[PDB]
From Swiss-Prot, chain C:
Chain positions recorded as staurosporine binding sites: E94, C95, L96
Name of the top EC class for this enzyme: transferase
Keywords assigned: ATP-binding, Cytoplasm, DNA damage, Isopeptide bond, Kinase, Nucleotide-binding, Nucleus, Phosphoprotein, Serine/threonine-protein kinase, Transferase, Ubl conjugation
UniProt name for this protein: MAP kinase-activated protein kinase 2
Lineage of origin: Eukaryota, Metazoa, Chordata, Craniata, Vertebrata
List of catalytic residues: D141 (proton acceptor)
PTM (free text): Sumoylation inhibits the protein kinase activity.
Shown chain mapped onto the complete sequence: 46 to 350 of 400
Chief place where the protein resides: cytoplasm
GO cellular component assignments: centrosome; ciliary basal body; cytoplasm; cytosol; extracellular exosome; nucleoplasm; nucleus
Modulation of this protein's activity: Activated following phosphorylation by p38-alpha/MAPK14 following various stresses. Inhibited following sumoylation. Specifically inhibited by pyrrolopyridine inhibitors.
Residues noted as binding ATP in the record, renumbered to the chain: L25, G26, L27, G28, I29, N30, G31, K32, V33, K48
Task of the protein: Stress-activated serine/threonine-protein kinase involved in cytokine production, endocytosis, reorganization of the cytoskeleton, cell migration, cell cycle control, chromatin remodeling, DNA damage response and transcriptional regulation. Following stress, it is phosphorylated and activated by MAP kinase p38-alpha/MAPK14, leading to phosphorylation of substrates. Phosphorylates serine in the peptide sequence, Hyd-X-R-X(2)-S, where Hyd is a large hydrophobic residue.
Gene: MAPKAPK2
Effect on the protein of changing D162A: Kinase defective mutant, abolishes activity
Length: 285, 284, 290, 283
């Protein structure tokens, strides 16, 4: 019997409990994230500021639901305050000072196929949890993937529920148990894009003729970066980047794929990612 | 960085915390106001009783938002209780035992043009705050303006949000930033009517009244108005324009020299004080 | 920086510029195609006659857009004229006197038809569909009659014609479904390509006649085979490609990019030279081809 | 009897006639502006690229109509081409290499009240023309006001019809909402910056939005202590929050400060320096 507690929204002023600096820690889809300190404990936290409305209510509601998952940024507290005579949802979440995923990769001098498999598996776990509770994230990108600390055993966590949406006898088919459109399969594409970048350092879709190469599904595995990468992985990427949403692999199929399943039986082959990523600081702004 | 706390609705029975008398302190647009006492502190407060629904919810919501302003009656607590098996919003607000604005004026024996200016400025300040946070009051009248105490330095406060309504790159015109009808300019009219009564003791508008209002037929008759500067008459004339869009905005009003420099306004005495008691009859 | 010129509709009488014969060169979905000659140059061209309306305007518009592609019949000029007191779009296009695709196949004996050549043909049909899809146009009528050769000379280019059914189909991490709706218009060309590929390898269609209201059900069921003796030489790789274009569920069907990347199309010149029965089965079956 | 020719859209490829560089000359509301060169004449021009649709058709249409006015950027040619298999309106316009209005002001070391009057008059004239032919511009901002050359006698020109809209006793001759009066506000904002170097409505961000709807601004010293009460009164009247209280363009062109530009005091303003001294919060 597992129940977890529901969301108690605090109504007292947030400045009673926290010291709010104005150091920006990130730009969210609807409001920026600031660095704040626990007044009593001195410890550091992140504050996202949203203006109260049905949209912001849903973000909080959906994020709270997924907050239990180990690979999703944990919500510490939610405040409802008045700011310049308007209502406000203020979300306090744990501090992910390990920085973005591709910043950590970019800081070495090498990255291996087996580590890429381990990263992908933990992103997968987050998506898997979300989907299993009928939430599509709809905005899985490089900027939303942060580490808890700089210490080498930090956990990778997913952030930002600004685009998240809800997706809704005993031999009965999955279609007959509630409608459900393509919301979910759209995370599966992101997973493919991220996997591609993780293995070579650049996106599969490049520099108005980009928009058509995406709908056509025109990309490659060019050398020298991809010449070591096993055909097994190329085949998995090919299957996540299918232009037709229903041809795309589901998250359960993905977590069961042997390349993800047995992360520790994947070849230790080195990739170019680490260098290609810093060598291309320009067109990454 | 200023945040103020949001509204925490108390769910426990109000009678746990307050002794509720049935002495009526006023009749609100939707429910009367009763005198109550803080059980623990003995101190006196006012309780407004509303039946829960979308209308009442909005009154509380809007009033809470404006409650920060010094010139608007402060909400102490909001209770949600069951009363005769129906849901209830009960609002506890500070006790304004200084009485109504025109009751205080009516009790001397004289009132000056400078004091009228100081009164108008504090009412102005209330409207200015409301408008700046996009709320129109829509019911600014004599009964809704009360004083905190009888002590001569009491603050004047605005009450009753029963009619209040919400009114909705960086060089773009005010019309292109959200629609907005005449909700606000309707306060500006009340301001004119109150200013008029403050300066002479009677209203500018006396079934043929209904047409004198839409026509804009009123005067500044003697002897009351013969002392009153042309500058003030001109301000009143501009608040009482029948065409809403011709009317002065609250920012223009607060910037008007007669309001701006209250203390540079002539000390000339008005008839208000006497005309007001001398006319107790047609004020019921 | 590649811009191409837009369409200038000529308003003067077409008969100022061309001699119009009434030799029919083909029947289009909405109006026949006639043989015409450039008055000044003596050279031969084809004229398609459409009656002006939103439908005909779209045909011209879409065809013009696709006209750039090397494997789509080139539009030379468009006239807007009055014919019997009604408005008219007259389209002048290059002359494809090499004839239909299956007419050329049907005319050999001397060096038979090979699997490698079928691969080269399929690749050039694919290139036309690929271009169309990439500019968001579905052709929706890719059949044998719409595939013609520029000349009889053995190095002639194969070209696709007839836009009478053509229809328009509408940061860096965004899914293809979130960039505009789009139904099954395109995947429907992919089926044609499968049917054409099948005929190209054996000389008959995968879906038959007889009963013949029972052909309609064998199509929706997906009942067809690779019978012998024709298919016994054909590699399993090709059969697998056809199986995948002829899927009855449109979404299961291969996209044009996957098709152009398939090794059998990609490396046309690495495809076995194995001879097919197509050439003979095609003339041997002149009857039920009318 | 004055007729002017209508718009002939060229259908041939634009690269037949022009060499198209990819040096960006500005960012428009719907598509950027590029530097291009006349292949035969060698002369320089600006190319705005729009994707064909009803929106773009209207921009071209309305811009062409206003292109006659001396204070509106002149359209040279309009091409309709295929670009990556989609239709395109390409607009070729005269090259305004004098730069933006506030860049020219920012480059001296002084600006006078009389010159601000002359600038405001020429902006006024463009608006006046537009309004008289029933077109509201709806996007009169600093970035849309450019000079023809660097030469000190260059003409100031208004650009970008991406927001322009057609606007159809004076009330009984056709409806018409507040489209026009919204240009009148822009004129006030521009005039305000022209006289002191900063906008009337500040940064400090969500409380700016309310200061605009409230109409809270000032004429603070030291910048405004020299500026005549007559001008402050004109600005006050263009910045009225109520659109119908706002001055019309005809009243504006007839105001003595605009009418007699050359009878306006030569008093120097701080604009020139306040503008470079504040390069930061202007990005
Ligand atoms: O929801 C969001 N919107 C988009 C970006 C974002 N970052 C965060 C976030 C949350 C917790 N911690 C951080 C954070 C803390 N410290 C950092 C140090 C150095 C780099 C990045 C950091 C991010 C960011 C939340 C969101
Ligand atoms: O919201 C309202 N609607 C209209 C009636 C009203 N009275 C009040 C009010 C609020 C606080 N104090 C009082 C009050 C207290 N003591 C008094 C003594 C004598 C006369 C009037 C008094 C009013 C009235 C609020 C409202
Ligand atoms: O749009 C169309 N509708 C379907 C039939 C068709 N044929 C053509 C066409 C176009 C250009 N040339 C020809 C043509 C020319 N010369 C020929 C000589 C001998 C046989 C066939 C020929 C076809 C046909 C266009 C269309
Ligand atoms: O319609 C528009 N949208 C907003 C930006 C813009 N710039 C232009 C434009 C038009 C003509 N010339 C220029 C131009 C040319 N050369 C320049 C050199 C240096 C600075 C600015 C320049 C502007 C810009 C048009 C538009």
């Amino acid at each position: 019997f597992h129940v977890k507690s529901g969301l108690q929204i605090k109504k007292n002023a947030i400045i009673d409990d926290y010291k709010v600096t104005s150091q920006v820690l990130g730009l969210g889809i609807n409001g920026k994230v600031l660095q704040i300190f626990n007044k009593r404990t001195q410890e550091k936290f992140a504050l996202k500021m949203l203006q109260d409305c049905p949209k912001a209510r849903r973000e909080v509601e959906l994020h709270w639901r997924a907050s239990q998952c180990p690979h999703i940024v944990r919500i510490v507290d939610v405040y409802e305050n008045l700011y310049a005579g308007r209502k406000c949802l203020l979300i306090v979440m744990e501090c992910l000072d390990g920085g973005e995923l591709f910043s950590r990769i970019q800081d070495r001098g090498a990255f291996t196929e087996r580590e890429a498999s381990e990263i992908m598996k933990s992103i997968g776990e987050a998506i898997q949890y979300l989907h299993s509770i009928n939430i599509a994230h709809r905005d899985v990108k490089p900027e939303n993937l942060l580490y808890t600390s700089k210490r080498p055993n930090a956990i990778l966590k997913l952030t930002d529920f600004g685009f998240a949406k809800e997706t809704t006898p005993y031999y009965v088919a999955p279609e007959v148990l509630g409608p459900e459109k393509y919301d979910k399969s759209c995370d599966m594409w992101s997973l493919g894009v991220i996997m591609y970048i993780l293995l070579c350092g650049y996106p599969p879709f490049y520099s108005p003729g980009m928009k058509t190469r995406i709908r056509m599904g025109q990309y490659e595995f060019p050398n020298p970066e991809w010449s070591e990468v096993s055909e097994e992985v190329k085949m998995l990427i090919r299957n996540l980047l299918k232009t037709e949403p229903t041809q795309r692999m589901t998250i359960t199929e993905f977590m069961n794929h042997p390349w993800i399943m047995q992360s520790t039986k994947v070849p230790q082959t080195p990739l170019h990612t680490s260098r290609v990523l810093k060598e291309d600081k320009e067109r990454w702004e």
